[PDB]
From Swiss-Prot:
Tissue expression notes: Expressed in the monocytic cell line THP1.
Species in which this protein is naturally found: Homo sapiens
Entry-annotated residues carrying N6-acetyllysine: 218, 226, 228, 248
Record note on what altering residue 134 to E does: Reduced nucleotidyltransferase activity
Effect of residue 348 to A: Abollshed interaction with the SPSB3 component of the ECS(SPSB3) complex
Result after altering residue 316 to H: Gains susceptibility to mouse-specific RU.521
Effect on the protein upon substituting residue 238 to A: Abolishes stimulation of interferon production
Keyword terms, alphabetized: Acetylation, ADP-ribosylation, Antiviral defense, ATP-binding, Cell membrane, Chromosome, Cytoplasm, DNA damage, DNA repair, DNA-binding, GTP-binding, Host-virus interaction, Immunity, Innate immunity, Isopeptide bond, Lipid-binding, Lipoprotein, Magnesium, Membrane, Metal-binding, Methylation, Nucleotide-binding, Nucleotidyltransferase, Nucleus, Palmitate, Phosphoprotein, Transferase, Ubl conjugation, Zinc
GO molecular function, one term: chromatin binding
The name this protein goes by in its record: Cyclic GMP-AMP synthase
Residues of the full protein shown: 162 to 519 of 522
Result when mutating residue 187 to A/E: Impaired association with collided ribosomes in response to translation stress. Strongly decreased interaction with histones H2A and H2B
Effect of residue 224 to A: Strongly reduces stimulation of interferon production
Length: 353
């Protein structure tokens, strides 16, 4: 399976060029947090306990960073929006009162202050040239260009240390893979809520918030083996992380080839990551992920993704009644098209690589 390992080798030696870039990101991020912490409403702002400032959503694009700011909201009350099991109105004199539209927490008012505070603060930046970058349109993040080289998306999330919403009751089916002990410990961690956008497959603007468990995703990815010592020695170097990379890259490359067509606009690394986690769940033994079976394992990842497309069924991994592939969200023609692109790619030993 030399081609896949070739591709990987390329992706990795590229992940080193500007990690002086990450150094810049960290400095900007810290100035911003200190500025945001001056405002009474945002005093509890901070990074997620993930052991990192940033992540790379796009593995094609090392210079694009993703950052999350968390804001704890104690004693939070959620109202589930219309049977969509992932979107919620937030309800509860505290400083957050200024973001109330009536009874509910308004995302657009909070983001409004957030952008303005940030936008003024990079005008006085004086570390390196940092400019903002507007949206055409609609996104919840904030995007900065550092040194006309490095981009950072900043997402603001609400943190709740309450127990997880009922819609997750039957989620995170990792019992036969990681232990049920691990599941229990995982669900004791906080959960997060982010502004939906670009786009919601709705709207355009109700003030609902979407659940996020990207901190839980990260933790399983770094502790992903049946064996407590998976990937910690030369004898147990599995290919689970490599398959996710290849899948993310496969989607990205196809999204590039059809850049100015629109058929793949609604597909992202979240679908790939979600399918991947299902495959992990279905193939729980480390021996099913032996480094020497890189080709087979990837093929499984691909054929599992294809079945999801064909059957329009991709369950959110934490929220099982949320279908990322329902016709309500992605049109069938779009899935049919991605199916064909992907079948083509499998049949030809992956030319996009
Ligand atoms: Zn491993």
């Amino acid at each position: 399976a030399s081609k896949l390992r070739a591709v990987l080798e390329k992706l990795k030696l590229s992940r080193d060029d500007i990690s002086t870039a990450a150094g810049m990101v960290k400095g900007v991020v810290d100035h911003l947090l200190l500025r945001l912490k001056c405002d009474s409403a945002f005093r509890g702002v901070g990074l997620l306990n993930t052991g990192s400032y940033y992540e790379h959503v796009k593995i094609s694009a090392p210079n694009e960073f993703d950052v999350m700011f968390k804001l704890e909201v104690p004693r939070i009350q959620l109202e589930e929006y219309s049977n969509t099991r992932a979107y919620y109105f937030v309800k509860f004199e505290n400083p957050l009162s200024q973001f109330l539209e009536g009874e509910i927490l308004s995302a657009s008012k909070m983001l409004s202050k957030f952008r303005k505070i940030i936008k003024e603060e990079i005008n006085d930046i004086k570390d390196t040239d940092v400019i903002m970058k507007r949206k055409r349109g609609g996104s919840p993040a904030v995007t900065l260009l550092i040194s006309e080289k490095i981009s950072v998306d900043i997402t603001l999330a609400l943190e709740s240390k309450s127990s997880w919403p009922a819609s997750t009751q039957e989620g995170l089916r990792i019992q036969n893979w990681l232990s049920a002990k691990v599941r229990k410990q995982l669900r004791l961690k906080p959960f997060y809520l982010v502004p939906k956008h670009a786009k919601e497959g709705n709207g355009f603007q109700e003030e609902t918030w979407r659940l996020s468990f990207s901190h839980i995703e990260k933790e399983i990815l770094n502790n992903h083996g049946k064996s407590k010592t998976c990937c910690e020695n030369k004898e147990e170097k599995c290919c689970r992380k490599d398959c996710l990379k290849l899948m993310k890259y496969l989607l990205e490359q196809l999204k590039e080839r059809f850049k100015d067509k629109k058929h793949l606009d609604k597909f992202s690394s979240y679908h790939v990551k979600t399918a991947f986690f299902h495959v992990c769940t279905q193939n729980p033994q480390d021996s099913q992920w032996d480094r020497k079976d890189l080709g087979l394992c990837f093929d499984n990842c691909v054929t599992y993704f294809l079945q999801c497309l064909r059957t329009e069924k991709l369950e959110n991994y934490f929220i099982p009644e949320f279908n990322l592939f329902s016709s309500n969200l992605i049109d069938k023609r779009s899935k049919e098209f991605l199916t064909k692109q992907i079948e083509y790619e499998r049949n030809n030993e992956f030319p996009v690589f």
